[PDB]
């Protein structure tokens, strides 16, 4: 993806967010950070992964933007300069959205292979059995040397 498409895509995904709420320079800053770490030009397979992380970081910057200003710590207002009176009572709204977004990554890109390896059962596949068995660093139960080593007990996991 080029530098101009990312701002176009992020703004649409964030419900048409405006420039003052989030500048185009900040989006490039997070976009560039994941470009150098994932060398997207070298391997184009990380386009969905780099795109998903970029949006999440932008939401994080939005939350901290409410902080460091007076918006986060106020929950009341009252103006009265005569006959005009106004009283109203997004920091908390951005919170659960970030939690919700991390649970539905398909909203960004459906090809993220999300939710595929929840349950793992060991010893029910030949591919997984031999990979563990043939690992030279593996130490299993058949290596119990006891008091002092004896040649009756194997020193390697793999079968001869």
């Amino acid at each position: 993806m080029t530098n101009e498409q990312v701002i176009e895509l992020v703004r649409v995904l964030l419900g048409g967010i405006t420039t003052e709420e989030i500048s185009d320079q900040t989006i490039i800053f997070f976009w560039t950070k994941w470009k150098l770490t994932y060398d997207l030009d070298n391997r184009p397979e990380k386009i969905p992964a780099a795109l998903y992380n970029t949006v999440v970081d932008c939401v994080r910057w939005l939350i901290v933007q409410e902080v460091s200003s007076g918006n986060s710590s106020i929950r009341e207002r009252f103006e009265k300069i005569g006959d005009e009176t106004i009283s109203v009572k997004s920091w908390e709204s951005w919170k659960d959205f970030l939690d919700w977004l991390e649970l539905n990554p398909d909203y960004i890109d459906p090809s993220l292979a999300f939710n595929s390896s929840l349950v793992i059962i060991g010893g029910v596949r030949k591919d997984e059995f031999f990979r563990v068995k043939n690992n030279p660093n593996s130490y299993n139960g058949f290596m119990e040397q006891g008091v002092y080593p004896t040649p009756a007990i194997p020193k390697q996991s793999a079968w001869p």
Binding site: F78, E79, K80, I81, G82, D83, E84, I86, S87
Partner: protein
């Protein structure tokens, strides 16, 4: 000391208005009078932020068009809250009262002359209240 009122509001909209200072001068060379042919000198400026509101009652002297033996004359007034300092006239001097341009009931724009200014010297915050009366139509006041 006051803190909240020492800063600009963030709920009620405020607007800026234009103003102009006023002096006077004598022109006649031989007339023995201080008046002479009086002239007024102007120097424009603006108010930082202001709020305009109309008179609250319906008293006969506060109505807009008034019936006189000559014809349906014109009258307008306002109450203004502002953070700029405006001055009235001072005696034994050549300074006149400041004026500021605001919309009227006839759809046009006319000059209003400051008549009453309220200040709170012991509080510190620069917030003022003014009371204004529209200049007579066809003249520049006095």
């Amino acid at each position: 000391a006051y803190s909240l009122l020492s800063s600009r509001n963030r709920l009620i909209p405020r607007v800026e208005v234009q103003c102009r200072k006023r002096e006077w001068v004598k022109t006649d060379p031989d007339s023995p009078f201080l008046n002479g042919g009086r002239e007024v000198l102007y120097t424009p400026f603006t108010a930082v932020e202001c709020t305009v509101q109309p008179m609250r009652g319906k008293a006969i002297r506060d109505q807009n068009n008034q019936l006189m033996i000559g014809g349906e004359e014109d009258y307008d007034s306002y109450t203004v809250y502002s953070e700029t300092l405006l001055f009235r006239a001072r005696e034994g001097t050549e300074h006149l009262s400041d004026q500021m341009l605001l919309p009227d009931s006839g759809g046009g724009q006319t000059w209003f002359t400051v008549m009453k200014a309220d200040m709170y010297p012991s509080s510190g915050v620069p917030r003022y209240r003014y009371y204004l009366i529209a200049v007579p139509v066809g003249t520049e006041g006095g």
